[PDB]
């Protein structure tokens, strides 16, 4: 049965609700982004209207074989009308194609659903600036003050500098980057760019990336692993055994692996700046865990909400324990008292 925080009141709409069969009273299903926890249940047999971004639509058609007639892509930053309700899709600064949704209800209520997001001050100058929001359904993934992390830019600078130095010192080193879903493409693309290489990957992963419009993609990615010194592997293979084996598969082209595991958060951020990060090493294999997040830090989230000043906040993450729920509600109270709303 569909939870309440996936239902938009005063509409026949749901958000990221495909794993519950036919939702009672749902006339249109919105999908914020192409991550499995959100799309789970879509397939070729789906025959209700799905509203999403252009990129998300491309992925629905090609990867899941959803039929074209049921896919309704909307342009960003554009007032559109769905079953008589004005809607706008806004960039969520999450993975490619990820959106937030603004709903303008017939009675005058305005609702923002963030989907998954990484709050940024650039959002303070989109269509949000111009009006009040009565209800915010908020991505609360990292809603606690221990979750502090660097900017994506600082993390990429660290990665590029590390990889460039390693391959310069040993031209026979291979760089590996882990992946488990779309998102975090900048990690591997920025590395390949500095080394003068393409990123080699499986045919299935190549086809996924080709679905995303990213300009100059024929230009940065390939299925020819032999001609590439940056390889993309499943995140599960980013460990000493998986990587020893990969190295075996390369037929003596390389004698060393430097691997990156972009993670959300790790407790080393509580004690260590980006510049201080060091690898785990075993033989000729080093693994760096880097804090590349596509979700708001605590402070990013706090600033977004104190700017927006919603009348009611509905959390969409960490809602399953009484202790988590209580903790988040206590922060929301603080934020409201400090900002004067
Ligand atoms: Ni996500």
Q: Which features characterize this protein?
A:
9 helices; binds nickel (II) ion; 22% strand; Rossmann fold; 341 residues; 2 domains; Metallo-beta-lactamase, Chain A; DNA cross-link repair 1A protein; six-stranded mixed beta sheet; alpha/beta
Radius of gyration over C-alpha positions, nearest whole angstrom? 22 Å
Task: Give the beta-strand count.
Answer: 18
- What percent strand? 15-25%
Q: Which architecture of the largest domain does the CATH hierarchy give at level 2?
A: 4-Layer Sandwich
Distance N terminus to C terminus? 35 Å
Helix content: 25-40%
Which structural class do you get from the secondary structure elements?
alpha/beta
Per DSSP, the total helix count is 9
For this structure, the CATH topology of the largest domain is Metallo-beta-lactamase, Chain A
Main CATH class of the largest domain: Alpha Beta
Strand order across the largest sheet: 13-12-14-11-15-17-16
Which ligands appear in the coordinates? Answer: nickel (II) ion
Along the chain, the helix and strand elements come as: EEEHEHEEEEEEHEHEHHEEHEEEHEH
Query: How many strands, what sense, and barrel or not for the largest sheet?
Result: 7 strands, mixed
CATH superfamily of the largest domain: Ribonuclease Z/Hydroxyacylglutathione hydrolase-like
Give me the oligomer status: monomer
**Number of folding domains?**
2
Question: How would you describe the shape?
Answer: globular
């Amino acid at each position: 049965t569909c939870p309440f925080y996936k239902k938009i009141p005063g509409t026949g709409f749901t958000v990221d609700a495909f794993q519950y069969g036919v939702v009672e009273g749902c006339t249109a299903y919105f999908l914020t982004h192409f991550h499995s926890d959100h799309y789970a249940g879509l397939s070729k047999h789906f025959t209700f209207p799905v509203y999403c971004s252009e990129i998300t639509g491309n992925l629905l058609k090609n990867k899941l074989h959803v039929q074209e007639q049921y896919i309704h892509p909307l342009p960003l930053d554009t007032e559109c009308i769905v079953n008589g309700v004005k809607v706008v899709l806004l960039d969520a600064n999450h993975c490619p194609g990820a959106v937030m949704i603004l709903f303008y209800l017939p009675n005058g209520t305005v609702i923002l659903h963030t989907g998954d997001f990484r709050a940024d001050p650039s959002m303070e100058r989109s269509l949000l600036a111009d009006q009040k929001v009565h209800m915010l359904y908020l991505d609360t993934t990292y809603c606690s003050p221990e979750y502090t992390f660097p900017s994506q830019q600082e993390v990429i600078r660290f990665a590029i500098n590390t990889a460039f130095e390693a391959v310069t010192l040993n031209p026979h080193a291979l760089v590996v980057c882990g992946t488990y879903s779309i998102g975090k493409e900048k990690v591997f693309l920025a590395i390949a760019d500095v080394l003068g290489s393409k990123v080699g990957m499986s045919q299935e992963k190549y086809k996924t990336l080709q679905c995303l419009n990213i300009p100059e993609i024929n230009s940065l990615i390939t299925t020819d692993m032999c001609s590439s010194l940056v390889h993309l592997l499943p995140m599960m293979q980013i460990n000493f055994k998986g990587l020893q084996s990969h190295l075996k598969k390369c037929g003596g082209k390389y004698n060393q692996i430097l691997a990156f595991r972009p993670t959300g958060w790790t407790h080393s951020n509580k004690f260590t700046r980006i510049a201080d990060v060091i690898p785990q090493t075993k033989g000729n294999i080093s693994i760096y865990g880097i804090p590349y997040s596509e979700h708001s830090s605590y402070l990013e989230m706090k600033r977004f909400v104190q700017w927006l000043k919603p009348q009611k906040i509905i959390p969409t993450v960490n809602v399953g324990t009484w202790k988590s729920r209580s903790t988040m509600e206590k922060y929301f109270r603080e934020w409201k008292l400090e900002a004067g709303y």
